[PDB]
Write a protein that binds this ligand. Structure first.
Ligand SMILES: CNc1nccc(-c2cnn3ncccc23)n1
Length: 338
């Protein structure tokens, strides 16, 4: 027996269809799950609307992760009462049967689910642009000084559609996030989306989220991860295939340079395609009909369009976090509509 019979051996609440909580919520069904716990669809009888309830595991490490998340969501929703900056809206929270519960507006599928729905062939350049404009607007909001929030775990699974039929999105999952200032986490970001400064053990800031976004947008259009490393050494080598050896002024200051490289004064890889020869121009199919040639003869996919997309992505994937494009200027780029 766990939690007087209410929990399973994984620290999760055992969902019961139709259960009533607190003379208020009627639980309907499970709609999502993850490391944190579970997400259920429930009817809020007081506000007369469907809600999603994120039920955190009954275990101290998971509870405390979610307490950080609640504080950051309360700070954000407070500075965006009109809900125009593409962050999920936390309505309220409570403790129930030894689980912290977060009540949200109900959302649809995540962007990984959308990629599966394309048979891993990618969404159109027009839909990629709509997702990009919303994501850059969210990053602009997180960079406002009273917030200064680094999400730290951007990936397709943490971006949800509002509606299955439409392009509107919201960002979720602030459990691993932090605020600019004191360096606390040195181990951060899911591996495929992890920035070079984190791989190299260097100082970091909000620019790590822009790196992740560049990786995500390429994957949304091609159907597959840009840099799919099996471990940190493989990850750095896959980055170098596309982007070349990082600049010497960065490696000369990197605590973990010698995990990957050796030092003419110039740096090279430790003993893949030669550095910089796996061109983004060819991954995107700029001149050859898009990914897999499958966009040949479709509207919305011209050479000029692809050159603008490539230009923006290369600015998001700058090795130097001081010169990598920032949200304000990404929004002004000619890839976006006037
Ligand atoms: C699944 N539907 C759904 N609808 C609304 C909100 C959420 C959600 C909020 N935070 N998180 N964190 C992680 C995963 C999902 C979620 N989810």
């Amino acid at each position: 027996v766990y939690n007087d019979g209410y929990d399973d051996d994984n620290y999760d609440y055992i969902v019961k269809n139709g259960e009533k909580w607190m003379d208020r919520y009627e639980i309907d069904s499970l709609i999502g799950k993850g490391s944190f716990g579970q997400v259920v669809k429930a009817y809020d009888r007081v506000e007369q609307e469907w809600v999603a309830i994120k039920i955190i595991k009954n275990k101290k490490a998971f509870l405390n992760q979610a307490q950080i998340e609640v504080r950051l969501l309360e700070l954000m929703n407070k500075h965006d009462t009109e809900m125009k900056y593409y962050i999920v809206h936390l309505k309220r929270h409570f403790m129930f049967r030894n689980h912290l519960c977060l009540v949200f507006e109900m959302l649809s599928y995540n962007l990984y689910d959308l990629l599966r729905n394309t048979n891993f062939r990618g969404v159109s350049l027009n839909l990629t642009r709509k997702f990009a404009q919303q994501m850059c607007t969210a990053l602009l909001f997180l960079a406002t000084p009273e917030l200064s929030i680094i999400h730290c775990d951007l990936k397709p699974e943490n971006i949800l559609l509002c509606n299955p039929k439409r392009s509107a999105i919201k960002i979720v999952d602030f459990g691993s996030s932090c605020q600019l200032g004191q360096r606390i986490y040195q181990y951060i970001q899911s591996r495929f989306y992890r920035s070079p400064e984190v791989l190299l053990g260097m100082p970091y800031d909000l620019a790590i989220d822009m790196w992740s976004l560049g990786c995500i947008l390429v994957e949304m259009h091609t159907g597959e991860p840009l840099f799919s490393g099996a471990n940190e050494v493989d990850q750095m080598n896959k980055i170098v295939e596309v982007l070349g050896i990082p600049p010497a002024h960065i490696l000369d200051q990197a605590p973990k340079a010698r995990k990957f490289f050796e030092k003419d004064g110039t740096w090279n890889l430790k003993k893949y395609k030669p550095p910089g020869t796996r061109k983004l121009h060819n991954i995107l199919g700029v001149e050859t009909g898009g990914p897999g040639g499958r966009r040949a003869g479709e509207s919305g996919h011209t050479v000029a369009d692809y050159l603008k997309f490539k230009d923006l992505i290369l600015r998001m994937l700058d090795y130097d976090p001081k010169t990598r494009i920032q949200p304000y200027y990404a929004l002004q780029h000619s890839f976006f509509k006037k």
